[PDB]
Amino acid sequence: SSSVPSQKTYQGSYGFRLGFLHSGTAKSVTCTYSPALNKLFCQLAKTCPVQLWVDSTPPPGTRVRAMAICKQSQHMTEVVRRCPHHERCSDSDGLAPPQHLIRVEGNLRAEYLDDRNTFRHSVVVPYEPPEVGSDCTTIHYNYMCYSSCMGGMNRRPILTIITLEDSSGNLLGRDSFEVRVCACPGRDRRTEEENLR
Ligand SMILES: [Zn+2]
């Protein structure tokens, strides 16, 4: 009735870790990642490219799961879901449950899970190796509530946990990042980094 997934970074046998575009903080950026904060800033329901880097190719049937949790210990048993307003909106892509914060864009093989025991939401896709001309695999995520949505992200720091799993669900790798969904990611990142003095 209470639990939390592990957030322990784990590179594993295949050298798994995340990467992000180096987009800077101009006002026009639709998303941007802060290395100093390990924090992705993005806009509501827009493309967030997240890169999967491995040193060696994982086995057939490997999968990539994303799940959101509250970062603070006093809230980590609370399931992260969309707020009442956005859950009722007509923004369904035909695949994602209306309550799920995290969607995958542009992948018809995305699978969405309400865990039967923990009730937590996640979205999982097949692992694909990098395409011709690329050195990493990119997943396009969408975050479907704002950080300020009460009943949703609740103005709480939220962590996204990305896990590399084998076909049976066993852990092969894990990485994570804080996520802020906001109107102007470039300005918000530069403002939060200004305090790093
Ligand atoms: Zn919302």
Author numbering: 94 to 290
Q: Which of the paper's sentences describe this entry?
A:
The tumor suppressor p53 is inactivated by mutation in about half of all cancer cases. Due to its low intrinsic stability, the human p53 DBD is very susceptible to inactivation by destabilizing mutations, resulting in unfolding, followed by rapid aggregation at body temperature. Here, we have systematically analyzed the structural and stability effects of all oncogenic Tyr-to-Cys mutations (Y126C, Y163C, Y205C, Y220C, Y234C, and Y236C) in the p53 DNA-binding domain (DBD).
The side chain of Tyr163 plays an important role in stabilizing the conformation of the L2/L3 loop region, which docks to the minor groove of DNA response elements via Arg248. This orientation is further stabilized via a cation-π interaction of the guanidinium group with the side chain of Tyr163, which in turn packs against the hydrophobic side chains of Val173 and Ile251. The guanidinium group of Arg249 was rotated by about 90° relative to its orientation in the wild type, thereby forming a stacking interaction with the imidazole ring of His168 while retaining the salt bridge with Glu171. This was accompanied by a flip of the Asn247 side chain, which formed a hydrogen bond to one of the two mutant-specific structural water molecules and the guanidium group of Arg249 (water molecule W1 in Fig. 4B). Y163C showed a conformational but no functional rescue, which can be explained by a substantial stabilization upon ATO treatment but local distortion of the L3 loop in the DNA-binding surface in the folded state that prevents sequence-specific DNA binding. Although the mutation-induced pocket in the crystal structure of the Y163C mutant appears not that attractive a target at first sight due to its relatively small size, our MD simulations revealed a pronounced structural plasticity, with transient protein states that are characterized by a drastically enlarged binding pocket.
